[PDB]
Design a protein around this ligand. Structure first.
Ligand SMILES: Cn1cc(C(=O)Nc2cccc(-c3cn4ccccc4n3)c2)c(Nc2cncnc2)n1
Ligand SMILES: [Cl-]
Ligand SMILES: [Cl-]
Ligand SMILES: [Cl-]
Ligand SMILES: [Mg+2]
Ligand SMILES: [Zn+2]
Length: 312
């Protein structure tokens, strides 16, 4: 067999949750295949179909500051670290489906929120009334799978193919942050009443949802230097959308106004307290080995406070 291998430093550090995939774009496909081979197995996919699929997915990500091919692979690596540390809890189909779900989860992102597409009156908002971009991302995933020689699931039966596509669809739709607030609340009550049951499919669906949120936001779980630089990338997108909202004659929300630039540290504080810490807290309750994500999130929250007090 031709096994995929990484340089020594990458081979060791890829197992850490806070791993950064680096600036060499041409290594990212090899990094993804390595993760698939180790978390799924070397017989999950035909290597030639998987490589053709990877390159079609890369080509349908756009050159935007944050919602780009690097984000896709970074999110898949977070999912890799969760699966390797909880390797008894997931099925064959779930392992196959979830790494692909993560690679495809922001396909053809234009750097604009669902709100902007609705205010602009974009055709996609007419086609998909809720979770607009997320239904588009999944539609792009299915288009790519249906290209000649791109069916990486061609050995599965009809019923198995239908199950894995249904895992991918739910996982991608769950990356809509508007849905996360209700999903984490339900998982929080379910956990505290002792009713959460990982054999209940509708409960698995909620846990995979939260895992997809945790993977999608994993830029706040990196070492401070990575997290700080990545914050510049998301704001570059937010501020461009704010400019576009002003052009429609609409006042943008504060996180999208480039004039409120000096309030970024306080904005981050609110984001960590309202969104990220609760996300990684509930996830650590359900999947205790995902502790290092919560720990690294708390450390970054402390760094932003040190910024606000004018020490950083
Ligand atoms: C997907 N995603 C969303 C956020 C995020 O920060 N959202 C957010 C949420 C709530 C409030 C504010 C907020 C209010 N404000 C008021 C004035 C100025 C600024 C400001 N920001 C921002 C994010 N960040 C991030 C950070 N570091 C690395 N990767 C990603 N990634
Ligand atoms: Cl390169
Ligand atoms: Cl482009
Ligand atoms: Cl085929
Ligand atoms: Mg998205
Ligand atoms: Zn994303």
């Amino acid at each position: 067999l031709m096994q995929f291998t990484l340089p020594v430093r990458l081979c060791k550090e890829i197992e850490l949750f806070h791993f950064d995939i680096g600036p060499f774009e041409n290594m990212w496909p090899g990094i993804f295949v390595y993760m698939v081979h180790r978390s799924c197995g070397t017989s999950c996919f035909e290597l030639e179909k998987l490589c053709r699929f990877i390159m079609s997915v890369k080509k349908n990500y756009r050159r935007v500051p944050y919602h780009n091919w690097k984000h896709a692979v970074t999110v898949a690596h977070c999912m890799y670290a969760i699966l390797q540390n909880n390797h008894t809890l997931f099925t064959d189909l779930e392992r196959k489906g979830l790494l692909i779900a993560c690679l495809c989860h922001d396909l053809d992102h234009r750097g604009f929120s669902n709100s902007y597409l609705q205010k602009f009156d974009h055709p996609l908002a007419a086609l998909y009334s809720t979770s607009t971009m997320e239904q588009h991302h999944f539609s792009q995933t299915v288009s790519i799978l249906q290209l000649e020689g791109h069916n990486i699931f061609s050995t599965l039966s009809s019923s198995e193919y239908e199950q894995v596509l249904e895992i991918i669809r739910k996982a991608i739709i769950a990356t809509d942050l508007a849905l996360y607030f209700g999903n984490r609340k339900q998982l929080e009550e379910m956990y505290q009443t002792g009713s959460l049951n990982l054999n209940n499919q509708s409960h698995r669906d909620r846990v995979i949802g939260l895992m997809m949120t945790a993977c999608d936001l994993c830029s706040v779980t990196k070492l401070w230097p990575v997290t700080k630089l990545t914050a510049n990338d998301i704001y570059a997108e937010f501020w461009a959308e704010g400019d576009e909202m002003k052009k429609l004659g609409i006042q943008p929300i504060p996180m999208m106004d480039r004039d409120k630039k000096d309030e970024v540290p306080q904005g981050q504080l609110g984001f960590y307290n309202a969104v990220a810490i609760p996300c990684y807290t509930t996830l650590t309750q359900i999947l205790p080995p995902t502790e290092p994500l919560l720990k690294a999130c708390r450390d970054n929250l402390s760094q932003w406070e040190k910024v606000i007090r004018g020490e950083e």
